[PDB]
Design a protein around this ligand. Structure first.
Ligand SMILES: CCCCC/C=C/C/C=C/C/C=C\C/C=C\CCCC(=O)O[C@H](COC(=O)CCCCCCCCCCCCCCCCC)COP(=O)(O)O[C@@H]1[C@H](O)[C@H](O)[C@@H](O)[C@H](O)[C@H]1O
Ligand SMILES: COC1=C(OC)C(=O)C(C/C=C(\C)CC/C=C(\C)CC/C=C(\C)CC/C=C(/C)CC/C=C(\C)CC/C=C(\C)CC/C=C(\C)CC/C=C(/C)CCC=C(C)C)=C(C)C1=O
Ligand SMILES: CCCCCCCCCCCCCCCCCC(=O)OC[C@H](COP(=O)(O)OCCN)OC(=O)CCCCCCCCCCCCCCCCC
Ligand SMILES: NC(=O)C1=CN([C@@H]2O[C@H](COP(=O)(O)OP(=O)(O)OC[C@H]3O[C@@H](n4cnc5c(N)ncnc54)[C@H](OP(=O)(O)O)[C@@H]3O)[C@@H](O)[C@H]2O)C=CC1
Ligand SMILES: CCCCCCCCCCCC(=O)OC[C@H](COP(=O)(O)OCC[N+](C)(C)C)OC(=O)CCCCCCCCCCC
Ligand code: SF4
Lengths: 116, 231, 89, 68, 123, 175, 317, 57, 329, 77, 56, 77
């Protein structure tokens, strides 16, 4: 009965109304010419969304700390410092390995012109 | 076997009527194949059944953003065959209208390149300078886009009465209208990163491919015709 | 306790009798972890303490990390075989 | 110009009757001189005002609501 | 353009009649292997043995040609045609150039005799 | 039923003026829908040569098109209309048809240029379609070999006038 | 090169007295000489009919109702061949004016459902009255009138009743009308057929390009005057049979109550006299002339190795 | 020969302030901000026509 | 119960009008940046043009392709419409003026903003073509990659307040805004906000008809004003302009409904002027810049911005530590 | 194998210029036994091998002249 | 063999004239219709050609 | 009729802003050219596309079209 839930139920009423208005209102009239295996992908594509999740789980692990920041003063501060640095080391692993690059397969072919 | 995925840059950033079959491995282009002929009309067969004066508009039809240069190359070929010499004023006037044609061409292509990369204000500023120049075309010839002005004997007709005082008034302000377009692209770091090691051609295979003009002079070779073999 | 028990049991039996594909097995694993969460957080509310909430916030993170690990494991399964069978691995 | 002062003083010079018809005809506000009219009936105007761009000095006010 | 297209062949001219016969039979095999992908690719009305009888008929047009150079130019045109058809570059409207006979009956009154050729003066 | 009740005199839709309250209602609703179809006006362009630059002068800041409501949705799935602005060769006539096929049903097309209606300069050529009249059913013809940005805009105004009297809702009233 | 296949000859005289010399070879840029008026050329039959008619250069006069649809028939003919002119069936001068210069004329005006302005009695027997009045008035050779199958007056079906009434009317007025009864009609994106779906009635479906071909083959020989033709496909079909062919290619009172509810809309709802026509089936006149009169026969309605080749390709680069 | 990093007149602090504070990006931003405050070129077509020379066709 | 439904349809009419006029505003200022007029064809000065476009696109033919889930393809517009609009509750137009005053408002605003990824990714599975998939892959990869640093900037800001309530943050910002100390964070948050909508500075995948188009269209600009609202409350002052106590002690004498009316006018005028300057800067950065390759984008987020953000994670609690300044609940 | 031989026969009767389908012996050579063309050599070979889903290199294909060589070949899979 | 920029040129000389270039990777037609029979730039080929296109 | 050109052949090249643009015209001696050929710069630029665009990403296949500046009146005629 608050003004919070009329919103939750009323935004769909907005949408249901408008796509009704078009489906009820516009021409359908389709045909064949109007209508209409698998590819390979590089490793960094799947890598960005797989390694996305362990950083996201860290960001919501900071979320209990920054609400409790006064109560654990000088002590939970250092525990969080150690937590953050332990994960910064895995991040410097990740950017030292050049993991998230897609790198181009053709060079200028650097190898020189020798003879005989 | 790295199997390649095939798409086209079909006709519908392709600048229109181009088809471009690319074969990809993820992100990379391992093979390219431009298909061409969707604009081909047989102008070269049609020139053979027209006289030279009637064959003159076939040339500003092709490369339709740089018209006076296309007229000029055919008129210079027929001049060389005819063994005649154009008067002095007729030379200077075709130097001048071959250079505002050069301004119009570089304007259109630099701003069209900036649009398909993603900068869209230079498109419109350059097209306003193109309106300022297409009026000079309509004063000089009759029509704005296709002018049959440069003819194999010379020039179609004389300038209108007060145009020389007008191209000056245009140039005085175009000098700064160009620096303005230069500022949001030349040292834009996004425009830089998008084109720094893209499209590199070595100077030795720029000759083997038969490349010329801004692509041959992009590679370090000092060659252009209006200095080397002047006319 | 009812909702967590039945999501865990139905999730378990949907995992066990999965013969149709592999990702039903992953999502039945995750819904099992959800049911364990439900049971524990109800017990934390009923006992008036945070310690079930502590184990629940830790097992949220462990469920996420296991999903990341195991889906990279599926990608490496798929590297050499460009197909995933319907009957299973 | 793109000013509000220009549309302001032109709306005051042309008057509200003529302002509503010029707003229902064009987007701009223009103050002309009535050089003459058409055999079809089309009033023409020339503007001498200082803050005008090239190719804005002359214009037509039509007669019909579908104009060509 | 140093890399070439997939179903390419470096155009090469044979000094022997029999090695060109070898290449011609290999080409016939390529065409008839590719008849089902032509039927799927161009969304055709009919079924695959009509593509196969047209390939055989387009080869029995040119069977009694003697001169080796004319058979070389014929083989090169045929391989270009195969490369266009297999790569899905030709469209259905030009794939069905080969079948003017099959799409429809063009109407009545087919002139056969001199007189029904004469009544419409060959139209 | 053996008695015919059809009137011996009833006006054609070009000659009929509204009289009843239902007629004024459908005329107002028709005016509203037509106003949306005009004030938003989205030009898919199939122009393949020179007239395309002359179209890009309708995007220029001297003769603006967005002040008319025109924008190039460069996909036929959302464009109201097509502009054949350039030649039509025999290699591209099914491609032009396939682009015309995909657009949604309230669709028009204007033919920009003289190469786009009746072949043009390239009329007697082996690889050319003698106007897109053979391929697509075209409503307005803009002539000019570079048909002046002036004239292309005028053809757009002529098409919007054709949109005035489309009568989508009066037609359902069997005028 | 091209050739006039619809014509027996070059020089054709019509029965009204007009001399017609056809010009050139066949095809788009030449002319046969006939002027034809196809009523309802917007229609599903009439599009194919004047596509086949304007293919050879017959001047086709089409009277249209709406102008937004008619645009798709401008493509079919040469520049100057198809001539659009507006028509209501009420204003009788539009009817006698569209047929004024025709030397052949075709009607196809027939509507599935009654609406606010037209029942079946004014579209089928009175519009045909007015068109045959005009052809009576104007001395037009070769009036062709298209009807439905099952077109008799003792029928309970108001559609079938008033279509038999319509041919009664056009035999009443013009004695020299050819009258043509086609079967159910299958074609591309037809209104109540293949796209409507993709039962113990039996009726023949005929392809519409061959009823249009057969109609035009009627149109030009005058062996065909004052004869009525029935145009039925090769083999007799059940509806459950047809739809299960379609299936592997890819109470009555409240059903009528449901169609009552759904007609009051702008989209083409099902007519109530249409379930009525479903129980009726194809009983054809034996004293008529079918497809083999005019020389055509109609078209009839009817894992382990790629895994191991996958084992040699590359999937992750 | 192209200059190394050590033979450059700019300090690392000076050079990377321009790096992290987007200097010439802001310069090119301010260009079009200047252009917001100037007069457009648009003429209103059926009410105002553009150029004519008598030679026009 | 008359009170809250009249309040919510007042809020709905305001925000769903203002997302429509944002479209008319972007066309006009993009035009004047490019030295041409915007639309003046459809209103007295060009207005109700978004109404003209919506009136016409609700008349447009919907095409459901051969390739497609039909149900998935038309309710991915609605799930992106609904969660692009649900986040409009928690923003305050004044102290305690939201459609729901819940004590965990940032957790809600952060959970709804993660629900907005699906209608990209899910609608790639609509019309299953091999290029209709990996473009959606690049889209969703960029989307998640930049909502990471979005969430990070949020949690950096909550280190100063230690409360997930939103109007508590704005009342906390009365002493100073949070952009004035943390101005690099305003730059980082602006560019992450531009990426999170996939605006055409940071667009790659651009480079239907009818209802699935207008739902995506409305969701795009509702996301524009919603992330602008997030910037307005946690980084700039939310509804805060100046003190305005002395002006009131001049004007008024006691609490009346006109005084609360005047105070609400001042507060939401400050909030709206922040939001309007922010939307102008979105269109202004759209006008001036080319776009990105996917590799420039991923290199930008994961290799440049995120290590700097780790440095910010270390530096800001440490200065809250050096001076004994920890925020209390 | 034995009704594999029946299958190879089974599609080799599915042609013409065959004036007795009972004349296909297990060493039937396509040219002299069956009166086949230069072209029907590689026609009916390609028809043999799409019956299985095998594919042939071409000196595996131009060598085949007879039914015995086909059913001696056929165990490449 | 010598010039990598030559082949497109050779290929155009193939389609307009029918002249062959032995030892050429991907000699086929360019800037003509795919099913086009004929070589256009040739004195026996007429100006307007042999065929035309319409929508059936 | 036109003027008559003396019999001969010429290749004349100037510098268009796209690059070197030439015309090779063969004069019969008649008043019609016996042969004309346009050497367009963009023809050689688009023929060179495969040589350069190997190993670039898909977005950088678009910035390289805008440096060879293909207007396509040049490339096909
Ligand atoms: C919320 C509202 C606020 C919106 C304001 C924007 C106003 C916009 C102005 C709207 C004007 C209406 C113009 C709309 C219009 O094209 O309908 C024409 C009819 O012919 C009229 O003209 C019939 C016009 C119908 C006008 C309304 C009739 C009363 C409402 C009935 C419900 C469309 O025929 P149609 O057969 O293809 O339409 C149907 C139908 O739209 C679909 O549901 C069917 O699925 C489809 O098969 C199709 O058959
Ligand atoms: C030509 O270059 C381009 C532009 O010009 C610079 C653009 O503006 C844009 C942006 C395009 C647009 C803004 C057109 C917007 C499309 C529309 C259909 C506007 C629709 C308006 C609405 C949906 C408002 C709806 C409001 C309600 C229903 C009120 C509810 C209470 C693009 C993509 C572009 O490519
Ligand atoms: C010494 C200084 C202080 C020291 C402390 C350390 C940092 C504190 C300050 C932090 C603030 C950081 C702001 C964001 C940093 C951006 C850094 C950057 O330039 O990215 C570089 C990156 C590519 O890097 P690279 O390949 O090396 O090439 C660079 C060319 N030299 O380039 C890219 O990938 C793309 C660059 C994108 C830039 C954003 C483009 C669009 C957004 C424009 C927003 C403009 C906002 C203006 C709004 C005005 C409102 C009134
Ligand atoms: N199952 C079938 O399809 C069968 C059809 N037939 C008959 O063939 C004829 C055409 O059939 P079909 O082509 O399939 O369907 P149609 O959609 O073509 O039938 C209606 C046609 O006639 C026009 N029409 C209807 N009423 C009027 C009217 N009052 N005034 C002017 N024009 C009108 C229509 O105009 P508009 O285009 O604007 O809508 C349309 O062109 C009909 O007579 C039908 O009874 C024969 C047996 C079965
Ligand atoms: C919120 C404030 C928004 C104000 C919008 C004013 C625009 C206007 O008033 O537009 C007036 C409209 C359109 O008139 P037009 O002829 O198309 O304009 C042509 C102008 N020219 C000549 C310059 C091109 O007319 C009407 O009757 C619409 C009545 C419904 C108004 C609904 C308002 C909803 C908000
Ligand atoms: S109509 Fe004229 S300007 Fe336009 S493309 Fe054709 S010839 Fe070129």
């Amino acid at each position: 009965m608050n003004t919070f839930i009329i919103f939750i139920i009323l935004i769909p009423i907005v949408g249901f109304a408008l796509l009704a208005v078009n489906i009820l209102l516009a021409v359908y009239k389709p045909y064949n010419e109007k209508l209409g295996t698998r590819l390979a992908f590089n490793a960094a594509f799947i890598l960005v969304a797989i390694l996305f999740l362990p950083f996201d789980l860290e960001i919501s692990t900071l979320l209990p700390y920054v609400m409790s920041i006064y109560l654990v003063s000088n002590y939970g501060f250092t525990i969080v410092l150690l937590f953050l640095l332990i994960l910064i080391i895995g991040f410097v692993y990740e950017i030292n390995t050049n993991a998230l690059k897609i790198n181009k397969h053709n060079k200028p072919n650097t190898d020189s012109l020798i003879y005989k | 076997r790295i199997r390649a995925f095939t798409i086209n840059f079909g006709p519908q950033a392709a600048h229109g009527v181009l088809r471009l079959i690319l074969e990809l491995s993820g992100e990379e282009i391992i093979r390219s194949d431009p298909h061409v002929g969707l604009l081909h009309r047989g102008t070269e067969k049609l020139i053979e059944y027209k006289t030279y004066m009637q064959a003159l508009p076939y040339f500003d039809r092709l490369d339709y953003v740089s018209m006076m240069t296309n007229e000029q190359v055919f008129s210079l070929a027929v001049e060389k065959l005819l063994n005649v010499e154009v008067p002095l004023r007729g030379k200077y006037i075709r130097t001048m209208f071959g250079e505002i044609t050069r301004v119009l061409n570089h304007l259109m292509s630099v701003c069209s390149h900036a649009m398909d990369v993603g900068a869209l204000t230079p498109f419109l500023w350059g097209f306003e300078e193109r309106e300022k120049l297409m009026e000079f075309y309509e004063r000089v010839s009759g029509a704005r886009l296709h002018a049959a002005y440069v003819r194999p004997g010379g020039v179609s007709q004389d300038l209108p009465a007060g145009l020389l005082d007008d191209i000056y008034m245009w140039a005085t302000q175009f000098g700064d209208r160009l620096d303005e377009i230069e500022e949001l692209l030349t040292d834009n770091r996004i425009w830089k990163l998008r084109t720094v090691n893209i499209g590199t051609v070595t100077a030795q295979d720029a000759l083997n491919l038969g490349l010329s003009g801004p692509m041959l002079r992009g590679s370090g070779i000092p060659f252009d015709i209006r200095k080397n073999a002047p006319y | 306790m009812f909702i967590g028990t039945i999501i865990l049991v139905l999730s378990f039996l949907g995992f066990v009798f999965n013969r149709r594909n592999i990702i039903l097995a992953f999502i039945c694993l995750e819904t099992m972890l959800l049911g364990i969460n439900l049971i524990l957080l109800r017990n934390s509310v009923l006992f008036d303490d945070i310690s079930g909430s502590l184990f629940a916030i830790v097992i949220i993170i462990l469920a996420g990390v296991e999903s990341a690990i195991g889906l990279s494991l599926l990608v490496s399964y798929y590297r050499l075989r460009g197909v995933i069978n319907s009957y299973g691995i | 110009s793109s000013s509000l002062y220009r549309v302001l003083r032109n709306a005051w010079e042309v008057g509200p009757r003529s302002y509503w018809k010029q707003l229902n005809s064009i987007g701009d506000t223009k103050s002309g001189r009535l050089v003459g009219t058409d055999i079809y009936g089309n009033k023409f105007y020339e503007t001498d005002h200082q803050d005008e761009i090239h190719l804005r000095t002359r214009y037509v006010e039509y007669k019909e609501k579908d104009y060509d | 353009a140093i890399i070439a297209t997939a179903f390419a062949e470096t155009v090469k001219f044979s000094g022997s009649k029999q090695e060109l016969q070898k290449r011609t039979l290999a080409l016939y095999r390529q065409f008839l292997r590719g008849a089902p992908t032509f039927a799927d690719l161009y969304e055709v009305q009919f079924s695959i043995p009509t593509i196969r009888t047209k390939i055989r008929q387009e080869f029995e047009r040119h069977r009694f040609v003697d001169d080796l150079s004319i058979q070389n130019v014929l083989y090169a045109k045929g391989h270009m045609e195969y490369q266009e058809c297999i790569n899905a570059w030709k469209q259905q409207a030009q794939f069905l150039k080969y079948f003017p006979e099959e799409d429809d009956i063009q109407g009545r009154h087919q002139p056969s005799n001199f007189v029904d050729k004469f009544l419409k003066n060959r139209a | 039923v053996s008695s015919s009740s059809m009137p011996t005199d009833f006006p054609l839709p070009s000659q009929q003026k509204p009289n009843s309250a239902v007629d004024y209602t459908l005329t107002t609703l028709d005016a509203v829908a037509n106003w949306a179809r005009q004030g938003s006006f989205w030009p898919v362009t199939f122009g393949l040569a020179c007239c395309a630059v002359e179209m890009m002068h309708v995007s220029a800041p001297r003769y603006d098109q967005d002040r008319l409501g025109i924008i190039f949705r460069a996909s036929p799935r959302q464009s109201d209309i097509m502009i054949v602005a350039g030649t039509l060769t025999n290699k591209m006539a099914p491609v032009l048809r396939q682009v015309y096929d995909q657009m949604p049903e309230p669709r028009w097309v204007i033919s920009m240029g003289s190469c786009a209606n009746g072949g043009g300069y390239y009329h007697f050529s082996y690889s050319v379609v003698r106007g897109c009249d053979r391929i697509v059913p075209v409503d307005v013809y803009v002539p000019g070999c570079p048909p002046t940005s002036e004239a292309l805009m005028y053809g757009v105004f002529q098409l919007q006038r054709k949109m005035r009297n489309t009568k989508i809702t009066r037609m359902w009233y069997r005028k | 090169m091209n050739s006039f296949e619809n014509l027996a000859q070059d020089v054709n005289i019509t029965r009204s007295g007009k001399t017609l010399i056809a010009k050139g070879t066949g095809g788009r840029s030449s002319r046969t000489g006939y002027t034809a008026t196809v009523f309802g050329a917007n229609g599903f039959l009439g599009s194919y009919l004047t596509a086949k008619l304007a293919k050879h250069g017959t001047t086709v006069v089409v009277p249209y109702r709406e102008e937004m649809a008619k645009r798709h028939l401008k493509v079919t003919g040469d520049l100057g061949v198809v001539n659009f002119l507006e028509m209501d069936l009420r204003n009788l001068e539009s009817i006698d004016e569209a047929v004024r210069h025709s030397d052949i004329v075709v009607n196809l005006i027939g509507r599935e459902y009654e609406t606010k302005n037209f029942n079946y009695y004014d579209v089928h027997v009175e519009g045909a009255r007015r068109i045959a009045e005009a052809v009576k008035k104007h001395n037009i050779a070769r009036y062709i009138h298209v009807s439905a199958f099952n077109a008799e007056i003792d029928s309970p079906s108001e559609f079938n009743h008033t279509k038999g009434l319509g041919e009664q009317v056009t035999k009443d007025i013009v004695p020299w009308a050819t009258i043509v009864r086609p079967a159910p009609m299958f074609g591309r994106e037809d209104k109540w057929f293949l796209d409507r779906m993709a039962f113990q009635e039996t009726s023949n479906p005929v392809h519409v390009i061959d009823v249009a071909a057969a109609l035009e083959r009627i149109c030009f020989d005058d062996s065909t005057v004052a004869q009525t033709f029935e145009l039925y496909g090769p083999q007799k079909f059940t509806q459950k049979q047809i739809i299960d062919m379609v299936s592997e290619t890819l109470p009555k009172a409240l059903y009528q109550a449901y169609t009552k509810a759904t007609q009051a809309i702008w989209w083409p709802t099902y007519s109530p006299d249409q379930v009525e026509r479903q129980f009726l089936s194809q009983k054809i006149d034996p004293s008529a002339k079918t497809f083999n009169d005019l020389d055509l026969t109609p078209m009839e309605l009817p894992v382990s190795q790629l895994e191991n080749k996958e084992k040699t390709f590359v999937h992750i680069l | 020969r192209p200059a190394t990093w050590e033979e450059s007149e700019e300090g690392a602090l000076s050079k990377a302030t321009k790096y992290f504070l987007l200097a010439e990006m802001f310069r090119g931003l301010y260009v079009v901000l200047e252009q917001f405050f100037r007069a457009p070129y648009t003429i209103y077509y059926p009410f105002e026509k553009g150029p004519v020379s008598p030679r026009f066709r | 119960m008359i009170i809250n439904i009249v309040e919510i349809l007042i809020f709905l009419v305001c925000v769903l009008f203002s997302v429509a006029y944002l479209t008319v505003a972007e066309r006009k200022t993009l035009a004047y940046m490019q030295r041409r007029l915007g639309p003046n064809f459809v209103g007295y000065y060009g207005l109700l043009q978004a109404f003209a476009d919506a009136v016409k696109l609700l008349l447009k033919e919907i095409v459901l392709p051969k390739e497609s889930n039909y149900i998935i393809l038309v309710i991915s517009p609605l799930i992106t419409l609904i969660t692009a609009l649900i986040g409009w509750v928690v923003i305050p137009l004044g102290p305690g003026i939201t459609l729901g005053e819940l004590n965990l408002g940032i957790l809600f605003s952060l959970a709804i903003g993660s629900l907005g990824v699906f209608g990209s990714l899910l609608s790639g599975w609509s019309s299953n073509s091999k290029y209709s998939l990996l473009g959606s892959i690049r889209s969703t990869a960029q989307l998640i990659s930049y909502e990471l640093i979005l969430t990070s900037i949020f949690i950096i800001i909550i280190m100063f307040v230690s409360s997930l309530n939103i109007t508590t943050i704005i009342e906390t910002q009365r002493v100073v805004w949070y952009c004035i100390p943390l101005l690099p964070l305003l730059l980082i948050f602006f560019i992450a906000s531009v990426a999170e909508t996939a605006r055409p500075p940071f667009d790659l995948t651009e480079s239907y008809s009818g209802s699935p188009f207008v739902f995506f269209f409305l969701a795009e600009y509702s996301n524009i004003i919603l992330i602008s609202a997030f910037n307005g409350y946690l980084l700039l002052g939310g509804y805060l302009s100046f003190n305005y106590s002395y002006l009131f002690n001049i004007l008024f004498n006691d609490y009346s409904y006109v005084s609360f009316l005047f105070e609400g006018l001042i507060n939401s005028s400050a909030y709206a002027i922040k939001l309007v300057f922010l939307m102008f800067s979105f269109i202004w950065v759209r006008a001036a810049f080319p776009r990105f390759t996917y590799d420039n984008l991923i290199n930008f987020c994961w290799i440049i911005l995120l290590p700097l953000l780790f440095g910010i994670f270390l530096i800001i609690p440490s200065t809250l530590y050096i001076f004994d300044s920890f925020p209390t609940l | 194998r034995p009704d594999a031989e029946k299958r190879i026969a089974a599609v080799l009767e599915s042609f013409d210029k065959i004036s007795n389908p009972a004349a296909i012996t297990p060493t039937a050579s396509f040219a002299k036994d069956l009166n086949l063309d230069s072209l029907d050599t590689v026609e009916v070979v390609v028809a043999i091998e799409e019956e299985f889903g095998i594919e042939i290199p071409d000196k595996e294909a131009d060598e085949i002249k007879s039914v015995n060589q086909a059913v001696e070949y056929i165990l490449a899979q | 063999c010598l010039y990598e920029g030559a082949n497109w040129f050779e290929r155009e000389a193939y389609d307009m004239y029918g002249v062959f270039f032995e030892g050429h990777p991907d000699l086929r037609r360019i800037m003509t219709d795919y099913g086009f029979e004929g070589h256009p730039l040739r004195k026996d080929f007429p100006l307007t050609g042999y065929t035309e296109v319409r929508w059936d | 009729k036109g003027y008559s050109v003396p019999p001969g052949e010429t290749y004349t090249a100037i510098e268009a802003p796209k690059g070197e643009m030439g015309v090779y015209v063969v004069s019969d001696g008649s008043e019609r050219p016996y042969k004309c050929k346009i050497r367009a710069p963009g023809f050689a630029h688009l023929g060179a596309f495969d040589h350069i665009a190997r190993g670039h990403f898909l977005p950088d296949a678009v910035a390289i079209i805008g440096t060879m500046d293909l207007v396509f009146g040049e490339v096909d005629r």
